[PDB]
């Protein structure tokens, strides 16, 4: 039986060493009451460009999109480097698990990834985004299949997903076949229908849906946490930014998979069959002796 | 641009020629205002045994389960026969499309199927249930893959699903790959979470979710109809049995698939790949010349 | 709800018009109490050669097998002919159904067949024996697949089998796939294990096992009748020859197929699959215009 | 010429390391007289939930079925793991063959399997149950075709079956086509008709039917052992729990298949033909390089 | 039980009313001892041209083949006409069956046919020759399939064949499928191997092989009669011309078909299958109203 | 132009490695004079049970048939295995062709087959028996159509047949249509009529009839060899066992098919037509991926 927290804070949107101390003070203030798992929202370190259109008509490419793009590119990180050693030391000083929504660069590209840290300051892995939604295709990149993780912990098996990857059926039935029961899902939209889109995943799974959205200035995000029977523990606080916590009874899953039970004993293997191609494909591959 | 109706009535649970005239009078009363598509709930003709347990401990099989089962078996139909000719003549007299939730027999078995009729009194086909949920396994049967239909009409493409087949991800992404935009879904549960489980399918698709539940005596079912942007047109009437109608603008789908667009241009074919085995398999196959 | 009788009498073994009047007097004496279905044993008209070996070493063929074989061949019938018109007139005078174990000839061969008559004196068909057992191969013939009948009556569906065709699994699961619920089985062995070999078919089916054996002078045959729950109604009378009757409640089948239910909803079609080749194959086929 | 034993003991129904030492002391007490093959009943390690109904009406799902199901799920094993290494070491210390009825888990499911061990402590394979009977469908799982084993030993060829798979004709004529002559069949019912249902398999085969049922507190099971001529060697001891042994003359099979001889020289291939589809089908299949 | 005679006489080779009285005096001399079936040799009325080659090199066609052919053509008969009325009156005056080897004409062709008469002077039918052997192709004609007869009599079923049609396997297994047990076979060769070629047909059938050859001046023909067990009753008289008789026990066939039994219960219909096309085909067919 | 030998020896009837060295010493003693083709009799390796009746009345089945059958079953071979590798090495050491009459087992059945070996120790194929004759049906098995071979060699085309398959007309006209001109025919009867039954096949074919029978202690078999004009080269030696040889002029076939010529230019295709169904049919057919 564990207990987990989510946050709802926002970034200062520029100069990423300034927003990295907010993470320190909030994670300590969440650590003061014996918390054990902390989830941060989407694009909390790199920043999420809202409202701007970069002046893209069809391919006119005016001069006030280029300077805007290079000022946005100059505020991203790269893993592993000097910017994740501070977060590893942050999560290492005491006992807490840590997922984190950052934005990485790799040679003048931008991938909207997410990170995973354990209680001993190790770097488990990362999960890049499969496909950006509508206009984020112009600036971000596509992820491959050799990134979806397993990540078993001594408090259960934790996974992740980003904003509009929760709507795919195939990716969720690829997550369910590995045994996820703590299903973190950061996002960056604020609508009323998001709660009704999460309750379906909570019923279809057996997993504690544990989301997080950010609040800034008005695009008022609402985060929550849902039991695997459709029971909202801590409600959708639309009012301000705060810390949101609840307890997680891990004996409430084997009593919840008595009814439905996805990729076991439903999902008839004699008629349906899925297979995922998971190859680490890269364009140019050097080889020496 | 069409308009469609659902019903919420119940059966008399015994003596199926008596409940077949309720269908006549309700379908005419729904036809008086120029309706064009009528959806009936799950197990409306055969009857839905609620509350009874048939006295099944682990395999004790007391004598008061056998007489109950034969009295229930004596009130089912068989297709095609004298019981569907009356429904074909019912839908043939004027212009209406008709889906219908019945229970068929085939040599001392019970399949929970669903029927499809056009405006000219033809019998298009049927869709048996893939797997019953928990205790219905003791009395009902399993369906195969060679039953999931396409059924294009001159008002669009219509499909169906039953109570807990809407929770599978693989069956819904097999329905979406054929091009369903009017997604009928009869059911026989009455909970609050069913509306939030339908809104996710309405967003993930692009289809007019058009459900129907029954109301009897208290297991108060609530039926509804949902636009493909998450807009409930006619609300979940939990109060009594009535007729529920709305209009369906078929120009609200190509403007709804500008954002998401499942099995096209999302659902990356380079990493995921699904294939459905659809063979009409039967146990004993006679062959002559 | 019907009632059926079996007999246990023997033949006079020679001169077949003499044994054809015993059939008349026994069938009238069974008809005096409102009986409706009468079953006669195996080889009741032609005769069953017991004890004789025809002096066959390996192919020595002494002279005292040939005269014995021609004296046995001179006491068989041929269908349809003057010998079945008398049985049709016998069953036509009042209302009774009739199965009958005879031996037919067809050009110096001997087939151990069985006959079927309705209440109006019609000749429905016949069912030849698939393969004789051990030493009967020397004198009898092999049957083909285009003989296994359906024979629906207005009191149910009746079929048949002979002595050691009840031990094949494939022939019984070919009988079950047509819907037999009154499973007549004449035989010509008298052992203790035959009752335990019939109770398994009564459980595996759902059919009223209705057997008949003959008693002569000591090879004391015992006939019986078994409910589809394993309930012997009229016992195995090993003592003398008599008439044996019981009643048949046809509402005791849909309550018996609640548990097991062969070729429906057991017998998984996704893994097993049987197919029967049923062609009327004959050696020399004349064709004209 | 070998000799084999069966047991009739029961489990302590909870806390599976406690019931695993009863197996040790009984298997040594059976090993003291030079035994060579030991058969344990159905669900001897995981436990067989008798009498409880889990409060399932039609889908009401009250709270006192969930805690009962999770307390039952917390007492199952998983293969291969730390619980079968002790049984391999148990059968390895001296010379004995071992079949064993356990219950395995695989990600919050329950399969009612059976195990096979040789005299050298190797793990040959397993045979999951094809379909549970009536109410066990609510908790257990369905097996596929790629599990039915051959398992030739230097004392003959051994196979298995579970409670109501012995009533299928197709599965038994799929077992017979591989050459089974020691046909183990654990079960968990106690009726009088089970002996008469086993004698038919003993005649139809040529195999030593070697069953085992459990006795607890009254559901008094009776185990036995049957020669391939219909000769009960050690009787159906309905009184208490004990050890039951006999000798097995393996020269009593080629003299028993002189009469009948299934899938050889009976079972006419020109008319009947069976084919079994045996594919290891699984829902989600990962593939890498 | 009948008795039959064959003859061995020769023709006067020219002027066919002269050789027609030899038939009268020989048939009366054979009728004096209560005979019942008389067989005459091949080409007894028309004449058999022996030794002459007609001077045919490859197509030189010298003048001394034409006059020889017209002198041979001027000594043939035509059926039905004034030449068969005398034979019908010959066989009508008392009780005898009659087969007869003649040569018919039909518009400047020559067919080597055979005739059949009963005890009442009726004309049953005829059997033309299928194909002449080597050099007879130059003068004779080919027969069709619509000529092979059945001809049941009140002393059995009689058929026929000519010189080298007894060597075909297909024609003999087309004769056997109609039920021939008195198998007449006229011929016109005189070799030692003919007796060994007839004994095989007598064993393969079950029929009384009853042949006849002619003796003239030295081409000494030898006729015989063979039981269906390989027992020559009246021997091959190579010395002169005479009358040859024996008795025919018709109870020696059902004791002879206990061993072999062609087109019944041998001749596996599941692998072999023969079909004979029997259409009365003619070149020019007039049709009127 | 080749030369061929037959043998007439007998088996020691028990313990088949003892009778396998007689084959070695006789085949070398036949190889000393430049022989090229060696034919062994019917059932030379497995043994031919003569005189015994196994005590079969009609189905009494006394105890002294079972032990006799298992002692006979324990002396048969199985192909391909360790018993044919020695014969392949036997025929491989020098140049000789080899046909051989053995008895094979396949899972407690007995098939009376025949084998074929070339000069290089290869295993060409086998020809099982189509149907056993009268009493051999009780112990042996039926062959299918997918076994009749072609087997062209660089000395001609060789085929085979067994005891009473030479009497069928359809099987011989199926052998003739493949082009057999060396027609081996082992047998196990000793009568006078067998020579007259072989001379007909020698005339009807064009093939060197090359038979072989065994001699033991009195059932004195007589083997021979026949030219395709009806000329016995080496006579029917009824006296003792010996080696019998002759020469085979292969230019004596195209001069023998000038007269008759079966399935060419006789056997009128416009009226007769045969077709053979040749499918490898088996009862239970496993299929995997």
């Amino acid at each position: 039986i564990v207990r987990a927290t989510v946050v709802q804070a926002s970034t200062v949107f520029y100069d990423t060493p300034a927003t990295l101390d907010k993470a320190e003070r909030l994670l300590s203030e969440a650590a003061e009451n014996g918390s054990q798992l902390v989830v941060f929202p989407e694009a909390f370190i790199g920043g999420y460009p809202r409202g701007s259109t970069f002046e893209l008509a069809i391919g006119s490419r005016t001069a006030k999109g280029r300077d805007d793009f290079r000022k946005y590119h100059a505020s991203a990180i790269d893993v592993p480097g000097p910017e994740v050693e501070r977060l590893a030391l942050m999560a290492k000083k005491y006992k807490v698990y840590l997922v984190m929504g950052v934005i990485e660069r790799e040679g003048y590209t931008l991938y909207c990834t997410v990170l995973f840290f354990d209680s001993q300051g190790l770097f488990l892995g990362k999960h890049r985004k499969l496909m950006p939604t509508a206009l984020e295709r112009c600036i971000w990149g596509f992820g491959d299949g050799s990134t979806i993780p397993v990540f078993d912990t001594p408090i259960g098996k934790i996974g992740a997903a980003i904003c509009w990857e929760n709507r795919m059926p195939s990716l969720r039935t690829a997550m369910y076949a590995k045994g996820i029961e703590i299903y973190c899902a950061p996002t960056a939209d604020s609508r009323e229908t998001w709660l009704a889109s999460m309750t379906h995943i909570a019923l279809e799974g057996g997993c504690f849906v544990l989301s997080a959205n950010q609040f800034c200035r008005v695009c008022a995000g609402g985060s929550s946490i849902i039991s695997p029977l459709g029971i909202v523990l801590a409600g959708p606080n639309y009012r301000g930014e705060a810390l949101i916590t609840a307890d997680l009874d891990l004996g409430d899953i084997a009593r919840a998979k008595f009814d439905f039970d996805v990729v076991g004993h439903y999902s008839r293997p004699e008629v349906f069959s899925l297979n995922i191609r998971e190859h680490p494909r890269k364009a140019v591959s050097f080889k020496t002796s």
Side-chain angles (χ1 to χ4, degrees), chain A residues 172-173 176 200-207 228-229 253-268:
Chain A
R172 289 184 289 110
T173 187
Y176 291 158
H200 179 79
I201 293 172
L203 291 180
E204 183 178 358
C207 57
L229 274 304
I253 298 168
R255 74 181 69 186
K257 295 182 74 67
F258 177 72
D259 293 331
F260 183 70
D261 197 0
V262 77
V263 69
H265 61 84
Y266 282 3
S267 72
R268 293 177 59 84

Side-chain angles (χ1 to χ4, degrees), chain A residues 11-46:
Chain A
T11 185
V12 298
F13 186 76
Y14 273 149
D15 198 1
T16 175
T19 187
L20 193 60
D21 296 333
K22 289 174 93 287
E24 172 68 31
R25 65 181 182 179
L26 288 172
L27 188 262
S28 294
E29 286 178 353
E32 72 183 2
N33 57 3
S35 298
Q36 199 171 3
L37 194 148
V38 177
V39 178
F40 285 92
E42 178 181 359
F44 185 73
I45 301 301

Side-chain angles (χ1 to χ4, degrees), chain A residues 35 46 63 84 119 121 125 135 138 179 213 240 249 261:
Chain A
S35 298
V84 297
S119 174
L135 192 272
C138 302
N213 194 358
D249 193 2
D261 197 0

Side-chain angles (χ1 to χ4, degrees), chain A residues 159 204 232 273:
Chain A
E204 183 178 358
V232 175
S273 66

Side-chain angles (χ1 to χ4, degrees), chain A residues 8-288:
Chain A
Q8 198 179 3
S10 67
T11 185
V12 298
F13 186 76
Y14 273 149
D15 198 1
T16 175
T19 187
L20 193 60
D21 296 333
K22 289 174 93 287
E24 172 68 31
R25 65 181 182 179
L26 288 172
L27 188 262
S28 294
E29 286 178 353
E32 72 183 2
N33 57 3
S35 298
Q36 199 171 3
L37 194 148
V38 177
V39 178
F40 285 92
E42 178 181 359
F44 185 73
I45 301 301
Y48 186 76
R50 191 178 296 275
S52 181
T53 66
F54 296 101
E55 295 181 355
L56 293 171
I58 204 64
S60 295
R61 273 74 164 270
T62 61
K64 195 59 70 178
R66 307 293 185 90
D67 291 330
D68 197 359
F69 181 72
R70 65 176 294 276
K71 288 185 286 185
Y72 175 63
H73 177 74
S75 295
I77 66 168
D78 47 352
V79 308
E83 291 85 2
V84 297
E85 296 293 328
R86 190 259 181 86
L87 290 174
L89 191 146
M90 183 182 291
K92 191 260 185 294
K93 288 189 286 184
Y94 49 83
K95 298 181 290 294
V96 67
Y97 289 164
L98 181 64
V99 305
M100 184 72 77
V102 305
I103 288 174
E104 67 185 3
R105 73 183 72 183
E106 187 174 1
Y108 301 101
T109 61
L110 279 308
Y111 291 161
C112 181
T113 178
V114 70
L115 297 175
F116 288 93
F117 297 105
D118 55 353
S119 174
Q120 294 178 356
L122 277 73
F123 177 72
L124 291 176
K126 60 185 175 66
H127 172 75
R128 293 176 180 173
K129 190 172 180 179
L130 267 295
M131 187 179 288
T133 66
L135 192 272
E136 302 174 355
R137 295 173 183 268
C138 302
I139 58 170
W140 290 353
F142 301 99
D144 55 353
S146 67
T147 318
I148 296 170
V150 279
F151 288 166
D152 51 350
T153 63
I155 65 166
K157 294 182 180 180
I158 53 173
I162 317 101
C163 180
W164 280 2
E165 295 180 355
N166 296 113
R167 302 287 179 87
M168 292 181 184
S170 295
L171 192 143
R172 289 184 289 110
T173 187
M175 291 293 290
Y176 291 158
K178 292 175 178 180
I180 301 296
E181 73 262 15
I182 299 169
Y183 187 80
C184 296
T187 184
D189 56 350
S190 66
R191 279 82 178 270
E192 186 66 28
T193 323
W194 186 253
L195 183 61
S197 178
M198 282 301 178
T199 308
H200 179 79
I201 293 172
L203 291 180
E204 183 178 358
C207 57
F208 291 92
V209 171
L210 184 62
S211 68
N213 194 358
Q214 68 183 2
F215 179 75
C216 65
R217 289 179 181 176
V218 296
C219 296
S223 65
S224 65
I225 169 175
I226 299 98
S227 177
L229 274 304
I231 303 165
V232 175
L233 273 75
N237 195 2
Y238 291 164
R239 295 175 63 88
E241 59 187 3
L243 294 176
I244 292 170
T245 185
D247 53 352
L248 275 73
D249 193 2
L250 292 175
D252 202 358
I253 298 168
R255 74 181 69 186
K257 295 182 74 67
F258 177 72
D259 293 331
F260 183 70
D261 197 0
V262 77
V263 69
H265 61 84
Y266 282 3
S267 72
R268 293 177 59 84
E270 291 89 3
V271 54
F272 296 104
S273 66
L274 182 66
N275 49 2
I276 289 94
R277 287 181 296 274
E278 189 171 1
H279 295 285
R281 298 186 186 276
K282 196 182 266 80
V284 178
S285 299
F286 295 102
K287 59 180 73 174
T288 60

